[PDB]
Amino acid sequence: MIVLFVDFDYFYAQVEEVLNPSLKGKPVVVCVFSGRFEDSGAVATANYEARKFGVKAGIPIVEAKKILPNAVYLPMRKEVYQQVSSRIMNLLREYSEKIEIASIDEAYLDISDKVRDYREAYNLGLEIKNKILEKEKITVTVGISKNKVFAKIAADMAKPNGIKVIDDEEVKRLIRELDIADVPGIGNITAEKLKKLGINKLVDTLSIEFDKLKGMIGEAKAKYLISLARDEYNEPIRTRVRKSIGRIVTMKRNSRNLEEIKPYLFRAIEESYYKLDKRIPKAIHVVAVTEDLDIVSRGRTFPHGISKETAYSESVKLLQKILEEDERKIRRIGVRFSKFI
DNA sequence: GGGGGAAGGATTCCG
DNA sequence: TCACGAATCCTTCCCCC
Numbered sequence: 237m238i239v240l241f242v243d244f245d246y247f248y249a250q251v252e253e254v255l256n257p258s259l260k261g262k263p264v265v266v267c268v269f270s271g272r273f274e275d276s277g278a279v280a281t282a283n284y285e286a287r288k289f290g291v292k293a294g295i296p297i298v299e300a301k302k303i304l305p306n307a308v309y310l311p312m313r314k315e316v317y318q319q320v321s322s323r324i325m326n327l328l329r330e331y332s333e334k335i336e337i338a339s340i341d342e343a344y345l346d347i348s349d350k351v352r353d354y355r356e357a358y359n360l361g362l363e364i365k366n367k368i369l370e371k372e373k374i375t376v377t378v379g380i381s382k383n384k385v386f387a388k389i390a391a392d393m394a395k396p397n398g399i400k401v402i403d404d405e406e407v408k409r410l411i412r413e414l415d416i417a418d419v420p421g422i423g424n425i426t427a428e429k430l431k432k433l434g435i436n437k438l439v440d441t442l443s444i445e446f447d448k449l450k451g452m453i454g455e456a457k458a459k460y461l462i463s464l465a466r467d468e469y470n471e472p473i474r475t476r477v478r479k480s481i482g483r484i485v486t487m488k489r490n491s492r493n494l495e496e497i498k499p500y501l502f503r504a505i506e507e508s509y510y511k512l513d514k515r516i517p518k519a520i521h522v523v524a525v526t527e528d529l530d531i532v533s534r535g536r537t538f539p540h541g542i543s544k545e546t547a548y549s550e551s552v553k554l555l556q557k558i559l560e561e562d563e564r565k566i567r568r569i570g571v572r573f574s575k576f577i
Numbered sequence: 578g579g580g581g582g583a584a585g586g587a588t589t590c591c592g
Numbered sequence: 593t594c595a596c597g598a599a600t601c602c603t604t605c606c607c608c609c
């Protein structure tokens with residue numbers, strides 16, 4: 237089986253460059269302004285120019301401005317990036333029936349039946365890159381391998397504006413050389429757990445008793461890592477369906493005052509329903525981010541769909557539950573709808 | 578003993 | 593300040609035969 241993974245380069249910022257080309261060549265920072273003060277918030281992403289100086293996704297906007305005071309700072313316009321993405325996804329859909337859109341700027345294509353060997357795979361990769369650049373003026377990076385995980389790793393190694401193939405022979409090498417922390421799904425928490433067990437590479441997962449691994453990182457993560465280490469991981473490319481829709485907003489100031497919090501909560505509900513469109517959820521969860529940036533939530537699943545009036549009513553009750561069961565002040569408040577009919 | 582579900586949270590980083 | 597949306601999985605609790 238041959239998998240071709242496509243990941244768009246510094247996506248949000250590149251889209252802003254496409255819409256305003258005079259931005260090209262200069263540091264561009266797309267920001268998420270939270271409203272607590274002047275430039276409160278964090279960076280969603282920055283172009284490679286800005287990243288050379290340490291400005292990238294996740295850092296505080298104020299910290300980015302200390303480093304690059306003259307960069308161009310733009311507010312994130314997700315709806316715009318989403319429409320551009322969809323167009324790109326429709327182009328890729330032209331190169332394969334088996335396609336998995338993994339996110340706003342990532343997709344996996346099973347090109348096994350329309351290509352022989354990695355030579356043709358590579359060539360199809362170039363045609364894809366070129367097609368997207370000519371049609372949308374968007375550069376992307378392509379990764380190709382025997383399964384989804386190595387196709388993604390391949391792209392990560394080839395970024396930006398690249399293309400790379402990880403053949404059956406390199407897979408074997410990577411299993412031995414690749415820091416296990418570099419494997420998708422292995423975050424900081426899991427990587428530390430694995431280090432303690434003496435697992436530094438995928439290979440290491442083969443000489444440890446499974447029950448021991450499972451006990452430390454969970455059955456699912458253990459079976460996942462072992463399958464990869466055995467060169468046996470082979471998850472099919474399939475359509476992904478959205479399972480939940482929600483919105484969470486930052487309040488000007490922290491609070492525990494119901495009447496002060498409600499307006500934010502209600503705006504979150506209105507936007508969430510607009511997003512749901514025709515989907516009707518049976519579950520609602522109120523999510524709160526506390527002053528110490530901890531996350532707490534309380535939800536309820538109904539035996540039927542939730543009307544907006546029901547959502548307003550139930551949300552207030554769930555919020556009251558949070559306030560009653562957690563003494564901390566609330567900093568961010570929101571809702572999430574799931575279990576669609 | 579174990580088959581669901583549901584609730585709240587841990588992790589991930591797919592953003 | 594993780595200074596800002598969504599999926600999978602895990603633990604615990606609960607109902608039931």
Ligand SMILES: Nc1nc2c(ncn2[C@H]2C[C@H](O)[C@@H](COP(=O)(O)OP(=O)(O)OP(=O)(O)O)O2)c(=O)[nH]1
Nearest residue numbers: 244245246247248249268280281293294341396592
């Ligand atoms: N709000 C927010 N958005 C993010 C964050 N990380 C990524 N995004 C958004 C903007 C990114 O352009 C988009 C795609 O994420 P990617 O991880 O693929 O990074 P990008 O595409 O920005 O850079 P890349 O060339 O792939 O290294 O998702 C984040 O931490 N917060």
Ligand SMILES: [Ca+2]
Nearest residue numbers: 243244245246
């Ligand atoms: Ca990307």
Ligand SMILES: [Ca+2]
Nearest residue numbers: 243244341342
């Ligand atoms: Ca991506």
Ligand SMILES: [Ca+2]
Nearest residue numbers: 417418422423
């Ligand atoms: Ca990692």
Ligand SMILES: [Ca+2]
Nearest residue numbers: 281293590592
């Ligand atoms: Ca990322």
